[PDB]
Design a protein that fits this description.
The protein is of the alpha/beta class and about 500 residues long. It has 3 domains: about 1-85, Recoverin, domain 1, CATH 1.10.238.10; about 90-380, TIM Barrel, CATH 3.20.20.190; about 380-509, Immunoglobulin-like (Sandwich). It is built from 13 helices and 21 strands. The chain is globular and about 80 Å long. Bound molecules: samarium (III) ion (SM) (2 copies). Interacts with TGM2.
Length: about 500
């Protein structure tokens, strides 16, 4: 009569049933296909839900759904605002690497700042477990002929190259079976480069991709063709680099950006990879546009934090993704809206690290440009309507010494320039347990395939700004309609024990 007794869960259930106290399979299929806008909505689905969520056994045997089970469903995997069908790998995985968005880390060794902070294998472990696929090892000479990793010329803690590798070996495929790219930033002496080469082949072993693939000769292989393998990125012999090492760079030869060009008469190759500071990438996306998109169809593009970000702060990755850029390196060790939109995007596709870019970005001859949209398959404007109905059991350990929270839900649309919007509810004074808002927002999203819906919850405070409580980012095409519950993740991406936001989602054309 407290934890339960969700006024709005009653308000939505009676709506369903009508005048009955339970949901007939017939009535349910109506709720599912009409409210829940379910394409599967038919007797069979409606029955799976009853058998998979109905608490009352009798009401389950007599093929019905009670308010208890109606709730048990809404709070469940199936009730979630994030398409449960997407919690599994479900996209084409036979496209070239340049047709995927690779989950990328920057200065992975770092656990904190870029100047005096610690470096730890824990950093590579934690990143790999967040499904990160492209790691970064800044290699340098170490005492007694053993290379070390650390952010050169700073007081950042140093760690052993070998240790870092053992760590990568163990956790590389815990969260995904898909290929991990080890970006090497070499500074070691030739004798220590030889050491690096010996540890790579010795520690990594068969997991390492030492030789090219037969048949792959005109374009990068696929995540499938490289499953459970690791490839190395770095400089490759143009003649200060040991053959032992260079022979290991096969599909990710580090090159300097020499300009775009299109398939018409020679340019960068599918095995070569340019890199860009967030600033430069933003410059080229403005000056070149689809010149860059086309460019990323064939080759991989690695983006990386500006240098002025010693605080290990991050950049919004969306604008980079919109330009086809695949290896957008962010400081995973830093909580913030940026890493939020980052992992959120990557929870998609079973959270396997690789995410197939929209078809218009895999078109070598595409004329798409995120900063100056034209007409094309990309322009397919919808209209999202989100009813921030009722949040429940919102965190409150942020202020250990007990009192009460002042909640407010911010809903923001992340996407192409035009679609980049945001809204928010009124603060519900002192109530994090059963806050009610019943407020609907409305967004117009011209280019949905590049959009992500972010539900964020704050703690209004005139003391120290509106404190962060929890949030959840859902990629547009992964958003479910009707009545759903949004499960709030913590500041570290760790889904809170039982913190959610009940909402009603709608998408019209
Ligand atoms: Sm570096
Ligand atoms: Sm308060």
């Amino acid at each position: 009569k407290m934890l339960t007794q969700r006024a709005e869960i009653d308000r939505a259930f009676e709506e369903a049933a009508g005048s009955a106290e339970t949901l007939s399979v017939e009535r349910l299929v109506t709720f599912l296909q009409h409210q829940q806008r379910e394409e599967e909505a038919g007797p069979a689905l409606a029955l799976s839900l009853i058998e998979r969520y109905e608490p009352s056994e009798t009401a389950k045997a007599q093929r019905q759904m009670t308010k208890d089970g109606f709730l048990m469903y809404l709070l469940s995997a199936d009730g979630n605002a994030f398409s449960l069908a997407h919690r599994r790998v479900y996209q084409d995985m036979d496209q070239p690497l340049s047709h995927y968005l690779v989950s990328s880390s920057h200065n992975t060794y770092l656990l904190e700042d870029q100047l005096t902070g610690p470096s730890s294998t824990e950093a590579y472990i934690r990143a790999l477990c967040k499904g990160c696929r492209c790691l970064e090892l800044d290699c340098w000479d170490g005492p007694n002929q053993e290379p070390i990793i650390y952010h050169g010329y700073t007081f950042t803690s140093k760690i052993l190259f070998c240790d870092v590798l053992r760590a990568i070996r163990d956790y590389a495929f815990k969260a995904s079976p898909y290929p991990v790219i080890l970006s090497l930033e070499n500074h070691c002496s030739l004798e220590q480069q030889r050491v690096m080469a010996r540890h790579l082949r010795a520690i990594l072993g068969p997991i390492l991709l030492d030789q090219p693939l037969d048949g792959v000769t005109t374009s990068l292989p696929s995540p499938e063709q490289l499953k459970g393998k690791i490839l190395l990125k770095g400089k490759k012999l143009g003649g200060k680099l040991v053959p032992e090492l260079s022979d290991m760079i096969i599909y990710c030869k580090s090159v300097h950006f020499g300009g775009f060009s299109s398939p018409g008469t020679s340019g960068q190759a599918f095995y070569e990879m340019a890199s860009f500071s967030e600033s430069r990438a933003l410059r080229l996306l403005q000056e070149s546009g689809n010149g860059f998109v086309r460019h990323n169809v064939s080759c991989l593009s690695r983006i990386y934090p500006a240098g002025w970000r010693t605080d290990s702060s991050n950049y919004s990755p969306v604008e980079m993704w919109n330009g086809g850029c695949q290896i957008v390196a962010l400081n995973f060790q830093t909580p913030g809206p940026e890493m939020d939109v980052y992992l959120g995007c990557f929870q998609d596709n079973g959270g396997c690290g690789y995410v197939l870019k929209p078809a218009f970005l895999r078109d070598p001859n595409t004329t798409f440009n995120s900063r100056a949209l034209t007409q094309g398959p990309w322009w397919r404007p919808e209209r999202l309507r989100v009813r921030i109905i009722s949040g429940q059991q919102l965190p409150k350990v942020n202020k250990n010494k007990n009192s009460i929270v002042d909640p407010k839900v911010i809903v923001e649309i992340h996407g192409v320039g035009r679609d980049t919007g945001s809204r928010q509810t009124a603060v519900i004074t002192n109530n994090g347990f059963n806050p009610r808002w019943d407020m609907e927002f409305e967004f117009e999203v011209t280019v949905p395939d590049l959009a992500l819906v972010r539900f964020m919850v704050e703690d209004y405070d005139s003391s120290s700004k509106n404190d962060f409580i929890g949030q959840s980012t859902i990629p547009w095409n992964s958003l479910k309609q009707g009545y759903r519950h949004v499960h709030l993740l913590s500041k570290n991406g760790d889904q809170h024990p039982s913190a959610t936001l009940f909402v009603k989602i709608s998408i019209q054309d």
